[PDB]
């Protein structure tokens, strides 16, 4: 037949494959109106109709991220200097550092950063009104694509850390507590177990106090995070996780005991030997309207303090022993108020069965107090909003509310709010929920706080810098102070107080504290992991070092790198005076290797820079200064000579006499390829010359621009080198302007020369070079360089036979502080190798569960395998099915078993660096050692698919035409003609939506004709 034509079955496979177009298409406006329905993803503006939410407490946050989404968004962040988002965070989170960690897949280091400054970091990531806080200051607001989703990123890293089930540990800088000063045994009382006291108690325990007790009124802990914030925004297991992290530090919590006359008072505390007290009881009473006096829940009237804890008790497994019936809230519901309380009452009422919800405001839309994020959740669930109304009468008939009468409110010229008596509204409703806010109005609670001063708002007065009340041993924070209105500011109040409580207690025991506040960071057992490594007789405190490059232009720069934590550093390559060089400009440019993406995370640079412009005398003196000040940090002098025996011995002896721990020989000088590093005989002789001249170890820095880099490495070993640095830059031309001129272009003539490519774009070249050397010359020390930009990629190089890791381009893309990310990331990766329960993870990445847009898909029988993509009529069918399950799960009200949280324990010793070096090399082989019997095929998880057809298009025009793409559902199916080439997996936007599995059917290679 015609071999180069598709048979009919393939032609039909290809039916939806893209084709070039020679005419404009004709589609009538009516046909287009009818077709639009089928593909619709987003809310339909014409839908007056809210879908059913009864008993549906699934996550509704727009900000929740999965790993795929988190990685994309962390890479987008500019990671700014002196960042304005951190300025705008009330707990001063180092957002730049934690987002950097996320971008490098170091979720532990990110979470550690987060919890060091905010012990409720996961709660805050979910509930912070970021548009009025950190995100409000984000520099990327100045771009069309907009500000960073900081809260969703914070939530993601904290959720991953929660899943690792690692405990908090006592501050490892402290002495053993037997040898702590008596002052740290002072009895400390905190009142109320909400965010403020949890934060305060956490920071005090970090400081070393061993007798800290939170007295909580209720039977449950967590404050409003537990009793009122809905489960569909803040899951209760988050609160429990943060509480258990506190209790890891020894904080005790006693429920059932109140700050109140005839119970706990400041007097009883003092008489019982408590030395300090923190008041964190919040605002316990609802703000009331006299109009509603006498109305009962039986009639359908609630305050927010009645209603929200009723919903929480029935929806938060682990709050009570009670399995509360969800309140039956049938009919029309009036919610009064314009803060967070009102909007959570409105969405919660829908979960209780409300038919319609009215949010009524005394003022206008311009005056809502909740942030636009929280408003949007009520708007998208079709709550109705009624401005400029003040309630006047409630109509009760038949024992139940049937209506509320309102009057119109207005402003005048002076801007005073009047009520117009003749302008009334009669609104039919079955349930009324007042959500005006909260107050402190309990005389017995205020009496228990005698004798502290209260202000005009009848709240305890504090110094806003120290949180101290008018009694020096009594501090206060959170909602009770009437300044904070957010979880993060309540957390910050307790943070601020902890330092000055510490100051006060220490002073009572006759001890001073430092004038500069110094609260400890957050620690786990991961931080005790040893990441030192020995190589060629040198001891490295960690395997990360600065390559000989632009970040080591000046020795002052190395000094700051050592102060930041870098384990070692190379000098910029230097030479004898007679070889002094002069740079041109421009000389370092961004790579075009990943398209027109500007800013953070450039995939390469190209440079036409020479060796150091600074003198050997400068470098030799600098090496002596750096080694005197940083004896545990390895300093390697990089040096270059022309092919001259006297020159190489003179220079190498000068560098050794300066005190360098080792030398690195830059083999780039030309001679007679062209560079000495490209000729094995020249490399052997240079190494022999240097070996005769010095006694300290030295390493030959190899170029990758050679046919056989193993032969160059072997030559250096034969000549006496103690190791090799693999590799220098790859020779390239980065591109041309459309007029043909180069970049970089030097002078009026716009000239250039070939430069060196660095960064992640050359990492496959460097990894292969390290691997081939490590396999051909086993045990010969390798210092790796080329695209290392994270602990994860560093570990790939260690696994491939490198002992230590040089970095340049990742610092050019950022700054020296990436070292803290690399060190915490390597500790975490090694630590997790000891945890049996996490063996399904890939490093710090949890096994990918079936999810849509960061949220797990409901595991429902009738929802699975029914060909229901997430659009058009199929989505409405999924909603129906989800709604029907939620109702079924209601009529049977069992299942309250929230697992008790217990940390995982290492089951083997934590590997050291020496344990992982070279351990991936066994998997490498020749092609003849790869099985062609054990073939695979692709398989697609339709629940994760976002219907783009990229797998189909890649198999059609780059593969085997083996995927069926459904014209109505846009769901792909791999068929039996798959060859397992794996291109589809490689182009799919969803991580792990496509998997390769063992082929179970007979396999025949497609040969076209016989043989």
Ligand X SMILES: CC(C)C[C@H](N)C(=O)O
Ligand Y SMILES: O=c1cc[nH]c(=O)[nH]1
Q: x/- binding map, residues 980-1009, to ligand X, per CB under 6 A? A: ---------------------------x--
CB of 975 to ligand SF4, least distance (A): 14
Residue among 451, 586, 778, 847 that touches a second copy (CB under 8 A) = 586
How many Å apart are CA 15 and CA 19, to the nearest integer? Answer: 10
Find, among 740, 735, 801, the residue nearest to 766 by Cα: 801
Residue among 947, 969, 973, 975 that touches ligand SF4 (CB under 6 A) = 947
Q: Which residues pair with 866 in a beta bridge?
A: none
Q: Residue 993, interface with ligand SF4 (CB under 6 A)?
A: yes
The alpha carbon of 741 is separated from its chain's Cα centroid by a whole number of angstroms, namely: 42
Q: Residue 945, interface with ligand SF4 (CB under 6 A)?
A: yes
Find, among 982, 853, 958, 808, the residue nearest to 60 by Cα: 853
Q: Residue 604, interface with a second copy (CB under 8 A)?
A: yes
Q: CB under 8 A: which stretch of 29-37, 208-216, 240-248, 505-513 binds a second copy? A: 29-37
CB of 734 to a second copy, least distance (A): 5
Q: CB under 6 A: which stretch of 214-222, 612-620, 910-918, 943-951 binds ligand SF4? A: 943-951
Torsion sign (Cα): 159, 161, 163, 165: negative
How many Å apart are CA 468 and CA 1003, to the nearest integer? Answer: 77
User: Is 857 in a helix, a strand, or coil?
Assistant: coil
How many Å apart are CA 441 and CA 197, to the nearest integer? Answer: 20
Q: Which two tokens stand for residue 725?
A: 């640095």
809 within 8 A of 605, measured Cβ to Cβ: yes
101 within 8 A of 526, measured Cβ to Cβ: no
State the CB neighbour count (10 A cutoff) for residue 24. 5
Match 């993870």 to its residue by tokens. Answer: 841
Q: Residue 611, interface with ligand Y (CB under 6 A)?
A: yes
User: Is 541 in a helix, a strand, or coil?
Assistant: coil
Named by the residue before each, gaps in the chain exceeding 2.5 A from C to N are 672
Residue among 140, 580, 746, 875 that touches ligand X (CB under 6 A) = 580
Residue among 159, 430, 609, 656 that touches ligand Y (CB under 6 A) = 609
69-98: contacts with a second copy (CB under 8 A) = 69, 71-73, 75, 78-82, 84, 87-90, 92, 94, 96-97
Tell how strand 354-360 and strand 538-540 pair up.
Answer: unpaired
177-206: contacts with a second copy (CB under 8 A) = 203
For ligand X, the closer CB: 5 or 1007: 1007
340 within 8 A of 374, measured Cβ to Cβ: yes
Q: CB under 8 A: which stretch of 176-184, 224-232, 267-275, 578-586 binds a second copy? A: 578-586
230 within 8 A of 312, measured Cβ to Cβ: yes
CB of 419 to a second copy, least distance (A): 13
Q: Which residues pair with 963 in a beta bridge?
A: 974
Find, among 874, 885, 879, the residue nearest to 49 by Cα: 879
CB of 665 to ligand Y, least distance (A): 11
Position with the least CB separation from ligand Y? 756
215 binds, among a second copy, ligand Y, ligand SF4, none (CB under 5 to 8 A by kind): none
770-809: contacts with ligand X (CB under 6 A) = none
Q: CB under 8 A: which stretch of 180-188, 264-272, 314-322, 594-602 binds a second copy? A: 594-602
446 within 8 A of 454, measured Cβ to Cβ: yes
CB of 84 to a second copy, least distance (A): 4
CB of 638 to ligand X, least distance (A): 17
Cis peptide before 727 (omega within 30 of 0): yes
Q: x/- binding map, residues 134-173, to a second copy, per CB under 8 A? A: -xxxxxxxxxxx-x-x--x---------------------
How many Å apart are CA 806 and CA 930, to the nearest integer? Answer: 32
287 binds, among ligand X, a second copy, ligand SF4, none (CB under 5 to 8 A by kind): none
Q: How many residues bind ligand SF4 (CB under 6 A)?
A: 14
* DSSP state letter for 526: G
How many Å apart are CA 455 and CA 438, to the nearest integer? Answer: 17
Q: Residue 867, interface with a second copy (CB under 8 A)?
A: no
Residue among 91, 118, 490, 728 that touches ligand Y (CB under 6 A) = 728
For ligand X, the closer CB: 177 or 621: 621
Q: Residue 925, interface with a second copy (CB under 8 A)?
A: yes
For a second copy, the closer CB: 254 or 597: 597
For ligand SF4, the closer CB: 147 or 800: 147
Find, among 611, 624, 615, 632, the residue nearest to 701 by Cα: 611
272 within 8 A of 372, measured Cβ to Cβ: no
Q: CB under 8 A: which stretch of 132-140, 159-167, 251-259, 878-886 binds a second copy? A: 132-140
CB of 606 to ligand Y, least distance (A): 9
For ligand Y, the closer CB: 225 or 607: 607
545-564: contacts with a second copy (CB under 8 A) = 549-551, 553-561, 563-564
CB of 267 to a second copy, least distance (A): 29
How many Å apart are CA 283 and CA 298, to the nearest integer? Answer: 26
Q: Residue 73, interface with ligand Y (CB under 6 A)?
A: no
State the burial class of residue 857 (Cβ atoms within 10 Å of its Cβ: 0-12, 13-18, 19+): middle
Q: Residue 977, interface with ligand SF4 (CB under 6 A)?
A: no
The alpha carbon of 616 is separated from its chain's Cα centroid by a whole number of angstroms, namely: 44
For ligand SF4, the closer CB: 531 or 994: 994
How many Å apart are CA 699 and CA 517, to the nearest integer? Answer: 46
For ligand X, the closer CB: 248 or 613: 613
CB of 594 to ligand SF4, least distance (A): 19
How many Å apart are CA 476 and CA 491, to the nearest integer? Answer: 12
CB of 322 to a second copy, least distance (A): 35
Find, among 304, 301, 322, 305, the residue nearest to 313 by Cα: 322
Match 């490495």 to its residue by tokens. Answer: 713
Torsion sign (Cα): 255, 261, 266, 272: negative
Residue among 946, 983, 991, 996 that touches ligand SF4 (CB under 6 A) = 946
Q: Residue 1010, interface with ligand X (CB under 6 A)?
A: yes
Q: Residue 756, interface with ligand Y (CB under 6 A)?
A: yes
Q: Residue 577, interface with ligand X (CB under 6 A)?
A: yes
Q: To the nearest 10°, report the CA torsion of 795, 796, 798, 799.
A: 120
For ligand Y, the closer CB: 647 or 992: 647
Q: x/- binding map, residues 455-484, to ligand Y, per CB under 6 A? A: ------------------------------
601-620: contacts with ligand X (CB under 6 A) = 615
Both ends of the chain: CA-CA distance in Å?
A: 17
Q: CB under 6 A: which stretch of 31-39, 89-97, 780-788, 988-996 binds ligand SF4? A: 988-996
CB of 961 to ligand SF4, least distance (A): 15
Residue among 383, 690, 988, 992 that touches ligand SF4 (CB under 6 A) = 988
105 within 8 A of 792, measured Cβ to Cβ: yes
Strand ranges, E, within 617-747: 634-639, 662-666, 698-702, 723-726, 730-732
Residue among 760, 785, 803, 806 that touches a second copy (CB under 8 A) = 760
Q: What does the binding site for ligand SF4 look like in residue numbers (CB under 6 A)?
A: 940, 945-951, 972, 988-990, 993-994
Q: What does the binding site for ligand X look like in residue numbers (CB under 6 A)?
A: 577, 580, 615, 1007, 1010
Q: What does the binding site for ligand Y look like in residue numbers (CB under 6 A)?
A: 573, 607, 609-611, 666, 668, 728-729, 756
């Amino acid at each position: 037949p015609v071999l180069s034509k598709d048979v009919a079955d393939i032609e039909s496979i290809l039916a939806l494959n893209p084709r070039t177009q020679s005419h404009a298409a004709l589609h009538s406006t009516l046909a287009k109106k009818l077709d639009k329905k089928h593909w619709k993803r987003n809310p339909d503006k014409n839908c007056f109709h809210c879908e059913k939410l009864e008993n549906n407490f699934d996550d509704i946050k727009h900000t929740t991220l999965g790993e795929r989404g988190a990685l994309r968004e962390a890479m987008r962040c500019l990671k700014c200097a002196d960042a304005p988002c951190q300025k705008s965070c009330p707990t001063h989170l180092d957002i730049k550092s934690f987002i950097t960690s996320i971008s490098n897949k170091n979720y532990y280091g990110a979470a550690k950063m987060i919890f060091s400054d905010n012990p409720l970091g996961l709660t805050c990531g979910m509930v912070c009104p970021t548009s009025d806080l950190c995100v409000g200051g984000c520099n990327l607001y100045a771009t069309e694509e907009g500000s960073i989703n900081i809260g969703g990123l914070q939530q993601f890293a904290s959720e991953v850390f929660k899943a690792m089930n690692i405990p908090q540990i006592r501050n490892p800088c402290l002495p053993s507590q037997e040898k702590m000063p008596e002052a740290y045994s002072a009895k400390i009382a905190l009142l109320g177990a909400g965010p403020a006291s949890i934060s305060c108690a956490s920071f005090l325990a970090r400081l070393g106090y061993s007798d800290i007790t939170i007295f909580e009124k209720q039977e449950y802990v967590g404050g409003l995070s537990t009793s009122e914030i809905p489960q569909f925004r803040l899951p209760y297991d988050v609160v429990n996780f943060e509480i258990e992290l506190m209790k890891d530090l020894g904080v005790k919590i006693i429920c059932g005991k109140s700050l109140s006359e005839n119970e706990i008072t400041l007097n009883t505390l003092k008489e019982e030997g408590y030395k300090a007290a923190f008041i964190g009881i919040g605002l316990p009473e609802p703000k009331t309207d006299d109009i509603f006096q006498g109305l009962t829940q039986d009639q359908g009237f609630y305050t927010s303090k009645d209603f929200l804890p009723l919903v929480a008790k029935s929806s938060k497994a682990g709050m009570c022993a009670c399995h509360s019936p969800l309140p039956s809230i049938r009919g029309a519901v009036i919610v009064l108020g314009a803060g967070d309380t009102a909007f959570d009452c409105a969405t919660s009422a829908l979960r209780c069965g409300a038919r319609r919800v009215f949010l009524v405001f005394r003022k206008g839309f311009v005056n809502i107090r909740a942030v636009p994020e929280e408003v949007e959740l009520a708007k998208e669930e079709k709550c109705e909003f009624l401005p400029f109304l003040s309630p006047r009468k409630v109509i009760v008939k038949g024992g139940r509310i049937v209506a509320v009468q309102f009057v119109r409110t207005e402003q005048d010229e002076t801007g005073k709010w009047n009520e117009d008596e003749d302008q009334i509204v009669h609104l039919k409703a079955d349930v009324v929920i007042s959500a005006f806010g909260s107050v402190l109005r309990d005389p017995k609670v205020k009496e228990a706080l005698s004798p502290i001063k209260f202000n005009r708002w009848d709240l305890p007065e504090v110094d806003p810098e120290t949180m101290q009340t008018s009694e020096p041993w009594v501090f206060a924070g959170g909602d009770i102070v009437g300044m904070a209105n957010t979880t993060v500011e309540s957390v910050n109040d307790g943070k601020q107080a902890s330092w000055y409580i510490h100051k006060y207690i220490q002073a009572q025991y006759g001890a001073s504290v430092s004038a500069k506040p110094e609260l400890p960071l957050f620690y786990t057992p991961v931080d005790l992991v040893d990441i030192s490594v020995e190589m060629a007789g040198l001891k490295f405190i960690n395997p990360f070092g600065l390559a000989s490059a632009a970040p080591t232009t000046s020795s002052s720069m190395i000094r700051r790198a050592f102060e930041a934590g870098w384990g070692f550093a190379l000098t910029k390559t230097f030479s004898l005076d007679k070889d002094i060089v002069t740079n041109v400009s421009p000389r370092i440019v961004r790579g075009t290797t990943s398209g027109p993406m500007y800013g953070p995370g450039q995939s390469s640079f190209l440079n036409i820079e020479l060796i150091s412009e600074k003198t050997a005398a400068y470098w030799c003196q600098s090496v002596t200064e750096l080694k005197a000040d940083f004896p545990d940090n390895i300093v390697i002098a990089s040096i270059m000579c022309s092919y001259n025996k006297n020159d190489w011995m003179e220079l190498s002896r000068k560098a050794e006499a300066s005190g360098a721990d080792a030398l690195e020989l830059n083999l780039s000088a030309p001679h007679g390829g062209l560079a000495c590093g490209q000729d094995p005989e020249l490399v052997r002789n240079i190494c022999r010359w240097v070996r005769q001249a010095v006694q300290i170890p030295f390493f030959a820095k190899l170029t990758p621009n050679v046919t056989d880099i193993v032969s160059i490495a072997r030559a250096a070993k034969e000549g006496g080198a103690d190791g090799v640095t693999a590799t220098n830059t790859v020779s390239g031309l980065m591109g041309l302007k459309a007029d043909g001129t180069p970049w970089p272009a030097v002078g009026a003539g716009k000239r250039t020369t070939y430069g060196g490519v660095s960064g992640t774009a050359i990492r496959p070249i460097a990894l292969r070079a390290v691997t081939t050397i490590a396999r051909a010359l086993p045990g010969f020390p390798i210092l790796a360089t080329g695209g290392i930009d994270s602990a994860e990629s560093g570990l790939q190089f260690l696994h491939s036979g490198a002992s230590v890791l040089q970095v340049c381009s990742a610092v050019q893309n950022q700054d020296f502080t990436v070292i803290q990310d690399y060190c915490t990331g390597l500790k975490a990766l090694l630590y997790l190798k000891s945890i049996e329960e996490l063996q399904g993870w890939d490093g710090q990445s949890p096994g990918t569960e079936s999810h849509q847009k960061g949220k797990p898909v409901p595991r429902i029988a009738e929802l699975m395998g029914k060909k229901l993509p997430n659009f058009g009529p199929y989505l409405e069918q999924r909603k129906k099915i989800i709604a029907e399950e939620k109702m079924r799960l209601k009529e049977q009200n069992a299942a309250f078993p929230p697992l008790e949280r217990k940390p995982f324990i290492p089951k083997k010793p934590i590997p050291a660096i020496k344990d992982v070096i070279g351990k991936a090399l066994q998997y490498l082989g020749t092609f003849g050692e790869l099985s062609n019997i054990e073939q695979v095929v692709a398989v697609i998880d339709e629940e994760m698919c976002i219907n783009c057809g990229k797998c189909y298009m890649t198999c059609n025009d780059s593969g085997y035409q083996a995927i069926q793409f459904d014209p109505e559902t846009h769901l792909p199916t791999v068929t039996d003609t798959c060859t397992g080439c794996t291109l589809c997996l490689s182009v799919c936007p969803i991580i792990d939506c496509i998997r390769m599995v063992s082929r179970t059917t007979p396999y025949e290679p497609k040969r076209g004709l016989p043989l």
